[PDB]
Amino acid sequence: HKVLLIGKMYDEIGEKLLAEYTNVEIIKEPKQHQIHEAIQDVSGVFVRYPTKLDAQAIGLAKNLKVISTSGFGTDAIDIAAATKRGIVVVNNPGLSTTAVTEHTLSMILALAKKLTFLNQCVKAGNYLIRNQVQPIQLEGKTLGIVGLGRIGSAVAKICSTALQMRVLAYDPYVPSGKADTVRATLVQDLDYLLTESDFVSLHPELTDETCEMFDLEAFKKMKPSAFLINTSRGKVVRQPDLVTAIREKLIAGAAIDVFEPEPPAINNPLYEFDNVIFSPHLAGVTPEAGMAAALSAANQILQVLQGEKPPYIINPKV
Amino acid sequence: HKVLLIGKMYDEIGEKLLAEYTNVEIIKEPKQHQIHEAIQDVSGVFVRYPTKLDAQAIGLAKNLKVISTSGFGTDAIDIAAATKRGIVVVNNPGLSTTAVTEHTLSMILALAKKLTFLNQCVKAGNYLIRNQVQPIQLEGKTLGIVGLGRIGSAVAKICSTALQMRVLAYDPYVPSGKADTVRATLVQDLDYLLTESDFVSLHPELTDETCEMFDLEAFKKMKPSAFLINTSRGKVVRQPDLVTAIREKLIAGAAIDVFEPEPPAINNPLYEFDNVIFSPHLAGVTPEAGMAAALSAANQILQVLQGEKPPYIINPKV
Ligand SMILES: NC(=O)c1ccc[n+]([C@@H]2O[C@H](COP(=O)([O-])OP(=O)(O)OC[C@H]3O[C@@H](n4cnc5c(N)ncnc54)[C@H](O)[C@@H]3O)[C@@H](O)[C@H]2O)c1
Numbered sequence: 001h002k003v004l005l006i007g008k009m010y011d012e013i014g015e016k017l018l019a020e021y022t023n024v025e026i027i028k029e030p031k032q033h034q035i036h037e038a039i040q041d042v043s044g045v046f047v048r049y050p051t052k053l054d055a056q057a058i059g060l061a062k063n064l065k066v067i068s069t070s071g072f073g074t075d076a077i078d079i080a081a082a083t084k085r086g087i088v089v090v091n092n093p094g095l096s097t098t099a100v101t102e103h104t105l106s107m108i109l110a111l112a113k114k115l116t117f118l119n120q121c122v123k124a125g126n127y128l129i130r131n132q133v134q135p136i137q138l139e140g141k142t143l144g145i146v147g148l149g150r151i152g153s154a155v156a157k158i159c160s161t162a163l164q165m166r167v168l169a170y171d172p173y174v175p176s177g178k179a180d181t182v183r184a185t186l187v188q189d190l191d192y193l194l195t196e197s198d199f200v201s202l203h204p205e206l207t208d209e210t211c212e213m214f215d216l217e218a219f220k221k222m223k224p225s226a227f228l229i230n231t232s233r234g235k236v237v238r239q240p241d242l243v244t245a246i247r248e249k250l251i252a253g254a255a256i257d258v259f260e261p262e263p264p265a266i267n268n269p270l271y272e273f274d275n276v277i278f279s280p281h282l283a284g285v286t287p288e289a290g291m292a293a294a295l296s297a298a299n300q301i302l303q304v305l306q307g308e309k310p311p312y313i314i315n316p317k318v
Numbered sequence: 319h320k321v322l323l324i325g326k327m328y329d330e331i332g333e334k335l336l337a338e339y340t341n342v343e344i345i346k347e348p349k350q351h352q353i354h355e356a357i358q359d360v361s362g363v364f365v366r367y368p369t370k371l372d373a374q375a376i377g378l379a380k381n382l383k384v385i386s387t388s389g390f391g392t393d394a395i396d397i398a399a400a401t402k403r404g405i406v407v408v409n410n411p412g413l414s415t416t417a418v419t420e421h422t423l424s425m426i427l428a429l430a431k432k433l434t435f436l437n438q439c440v441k442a443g444n445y446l447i448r449n450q451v452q453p454i455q456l457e458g459k460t461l462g463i464v465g466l467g468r469i470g471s472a473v474a475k476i477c478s479t480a481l482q483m484r485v486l487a488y489d490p491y492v493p494s495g496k497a498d499t500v501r502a503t504l505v506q507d508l509d510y511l512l513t514e515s516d517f518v519s520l521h522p523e524l525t526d527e528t529c530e531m532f533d534l535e536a537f538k539k540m541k542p543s544a545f546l547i548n549t550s551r552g553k554v555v556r557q558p559d560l561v562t563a564i565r566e567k568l569i570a571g572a573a574i575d576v577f578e579p580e581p582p583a584i585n586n587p588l589y590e591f592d593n594v595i596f597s598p599h600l601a602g603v604t605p606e607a608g609m610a611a612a613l614s615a616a617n618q619i620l621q622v623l624q625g626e627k628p629p630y631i632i633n634p635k636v
Pocket residue numbers: 094096097100146147148149150151152170171172173174202203204205206207209210231232233257258281282283284285
């Protein structure tokens with residue numbers, strides 16, 4: 001059998017597992033015509049996000065049995081065209097879940113400890129600022145998690161048990177009782193999470209309800225001493241309302257890994273404040289997370305090519 | 319009875335607990351002669367670090383039974399002069415261990431996630447470094463803890479279970495089995511902890527055995543990819559040897575909260591490197607930490623003034 005890598009994988013480990021059992025062709029920097037001239041006599045396809053997979057390419061693929069995406073995004077693959085030709089469309093999500101949770105923990109602790117601000121002062125000979133800064137102790141503070149999914153649960157679990165925090169959670173579409181498996185308390189009114197929390201960490205899916213969910217109206221309800229952490233999606237915060245929340249001191253600070261205009265401009269107003277800490281959308285980027293994405297893509301190809309059902313099919317009708 | 323507060327307590331809680339049972343005089347911004355003219359008819363003394371306590375002031379104190387420091391440091395109190403007049407010198411250590419534990423966690427995470435370096439770049443318009451930086455995933459990495467005491471145990475406990483790290487410990491004066499209560503494994507050969515660790519965090523007592531314990535010879539054994547965290551004491555590291563470890567890249571980075579010489583100068587050679595992040599001896603400085611020290615200093619005074627032997631006597635000979 002033959003397997004086509006439409007673009008490189010996140011790590012070479014998945015390229016060797018496939019080449020171990022199949023014949024692998026790699027298309028680096030894929031063009032539209034290049035897919036058709038190689039997808040014909042091919043049994044498995046790996047699509048690196050965000051390159052497109054036409055209904056044309058699926059049709060020119062006659063022996064195609066499994067198409068695998070690089071991560072969570074499946075919006076560039078014609079899912080409808082594959083359910084007709086019997087092709088199984090498989091996903092690879094959540095494979096950077098421990099990486100993002102470690103990252104948000106990093107940012108919660110940095111905000112509480114004023115890590116970035118204290119580092120700059122010491123480096124500027126201003127060691128003496130220690131008489132003007134009070135680090136925050138996380139123990140006993142309440143951490144409100146918006147989105148009790150893969151990442152929110154793991155973040156809640158660590159903050160509730162190891163860090164001894166009171167953890168509240170807002171997630172309408174999660175089984176009531178899930179929060180107890182993780183030592184959080186499920187909350188039905190998001191206003192209650194805002195008024196009780198000293199730290200707010202966003203982990204929801206970007207739906208048509210969470211887009212710009214965190215408004216200036218939400219910020220006014222939060223404690224002046226509270227912080228915001230966002231490793232989810234940029235659009236979950238109305239970025240202009242966050243700029244005024246910091247400037248008007250409605251909020252004590254914020255840690256951001258995702259941006260609404262992404263990439264953010266050079267002239268971003270948030271960069272002005274020591275209040276605000278950034279990372280360039282790297283929360284889920286660790287070497288181990290890349291291998292898990294590569295290994296999960298190679299394993300789900302071999303499962304379909306041999307009979308067995310893979311775990312992440314978007315095509316249950318096959 | 320009368321108690322003199324040579325300086326304010328870290329929180330008003332210890333001053334009221336003392337004022338509940340004794341007559342309290344407070345000397346804010348204490349001068350030496352002010353100590354001399356008030357320590358006379360007084361049974362207990364609280365000395366706020368770092369103000370001095372002379373053999374003169376101790377000599378002028380006739381009814382003095384207990385002197386209590388504000389924290390751990392007793393080097394500004396004439397302990398020899400107090401053992402002679404029978405006065406009990408009391409310490410206040412271990413009252414901020416959760417603060418240091420949270421602080422060391424902050425710095426381990428920041429080093430793995432390159433938090434400070436990523437923040438400055440994003441703020442400097444260099445969002446594009448995300449193609450050049452790899453955050454480290456803590457899960458599965460080995461954390462070597464030097465000193466399995468109050469802070470060392472707490473750091474181990476969180477890292478072994480919540481962060482899913484293999485935790486090693488080096489502590490010759492600890493019962494093997496203390497590491498087991500905390501899901502670490504106690505190790506007898508420090509060379510094993512240096513060659514196996516991806517992160518080494520120092521939490522030992524500063525003795526003549528740990529003084530400059532971390533030499534250029536120690537750094538040579540660590541992995542080129544490993545990191546160093548020091549929230550203990552500045553002298554446990556030979557500061558010049560740390561600079562050559564960073565400069566010659568024997569080590570991947572370092573986070574320090576304590577310095578030798580302390581305070582660090584404006585021209586510190588470590589400030590050059592993005593590898594190295596600093597905090598100005600604030601690891602144990604949180605509001606909750608101040609209250610426990612205030613209460614513990616006020617309680618060890620009332621313990622001596624009522625019969626009971628206090629827990630932290632530097633004067634066991636009475
Ligand atoms: N490198 C990165 O920054 C990175 C990496 C991975 C994921 N993420 C982002 O983190 C976020 C969380 O990821 P995940 O894997 O936990 O997703 P998930 O699918 O496992 O869970 C998302 C949760 O959001 C909840 N939710 C849905 N609508 C909500 C609403 N209106 N209000 C509150 N909660 C709602 C859902 O019930 C679900 O429990 C996602 O937006 C994802 O894109 C970022």
